[PDB]
């Protein structure tokens, strides 16, 4: 399973000038391109070595296209302010995500195109890539207009065809990293809270992709009481980190086992103190 995803945020600046626009591109959990209106180049920039392989015609295209995306969102911010009957004094946010998934065969699996205003669902293309999920009556108006203009049909042609063609190209060219898994480097730590009570903490580091499961079990039986899970987090170097802890009576540490599932492990690992 693989994906390509583009994320766009536009933020109106009522004090002066035009909205802040930030675009980012991903293949699975690897960011590969950026654009930022506040940045000085006014180009789509590379963020992974394997996309720097692309020639100038690629960078001119993506820059032209991303600037046109930027304008579309500027205009959208105006439309929405009118629809929701808001003043020009407030700063508002528009966000768009689109992209495609492929299965292990590299064939079209799924498509995406969804949109939010001030952080709430507005309009989304449904799984079939033919109909829409409008959240409220403003979005309903957009739904009727987009149906009339055959927007679904146009997005479908990209997401089913051209989108997967790029993803395929990128997967080949980035195969040394994008198609390599990095298994978690695991270990455990002990923290005496008192004479009676102690904390075991089970660590997963330097792993890719981000998807991982850490579970504790006491005496070979899943335990959720007295545990904690932190959200999975980026190391900074393209890999991720996570941990899980459990509070345990002092001297009972050997009952408890940490279980680690991840794509880069052929079998799940088990750890014990």
């Amino acid at each position: 399973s693989h994906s390509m995803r583009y994320f766009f945020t536009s933020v109106s600046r009522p004090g002066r000038g035009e909205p802040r626009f930030i675009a980012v591109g991903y293949v699975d959990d690897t960011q590969f391109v950026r654009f930022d209106s506040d940045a000085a180049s006014q180009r789509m920039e590379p963020r992974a070595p394997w996309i720097e392989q692309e020639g100038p015609e690629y960078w001119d295209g993506e820059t032209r296209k991303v600037k046109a995306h930027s304008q579309t969102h500027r205009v959208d911010l105006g439309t929405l302010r009118g629809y929701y009957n808001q003043s020009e004094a407030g700063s508002h946010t528009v966000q768009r995500m689109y992209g495609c998934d492929v299965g292990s065969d590299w064939r079209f699996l799924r498509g995406y195109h969804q949109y939010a205003y001030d952080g709430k669902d507005y309009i989304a293309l449904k799984e079939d890539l033919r109909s829409w999920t409008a959240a409220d009556m403003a979005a309903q108006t957009t739904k009727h207009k987009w149906e009339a203009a055959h927007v679904a049909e146009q997005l479908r042609a990209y997401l089913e065809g051209t989108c997967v063609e790029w993803l395929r190209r990128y997967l080949e060219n980035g195969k040394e990293t994008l198609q390599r898994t990095d298994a978690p480097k695991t270990h455990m730590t002990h923290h005496a809270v008192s004479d009676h009570e102690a904390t075991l903490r089970c660590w997963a580091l330097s792993f890719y992709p981000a998807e991982i499961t850490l579970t504790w079990q006491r005496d070979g039986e899943d335990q959720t009481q007295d545990t904690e899970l932190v959200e999975t987090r980026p190391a900074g170097d393209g890999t991720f980190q996570k941990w899980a802890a459990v509070v345990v009576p002092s001297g009972q540490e050997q009952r408890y086992t940490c279980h680690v599932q991840h794509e880069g492990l052929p079998k799940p690992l088990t750890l014990r103190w």
Binding site: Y6, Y58, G61, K65, T72, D76, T79, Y158, T162, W166
Partner: peptide, 10 residues
């Protein structure tokens, strides 16, 4: 690669 054009709301 980005789509050639995205729909405006209006």
């Amino acid at each position: 690669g980005l789509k050639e054009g995205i729909p405006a709301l209006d």
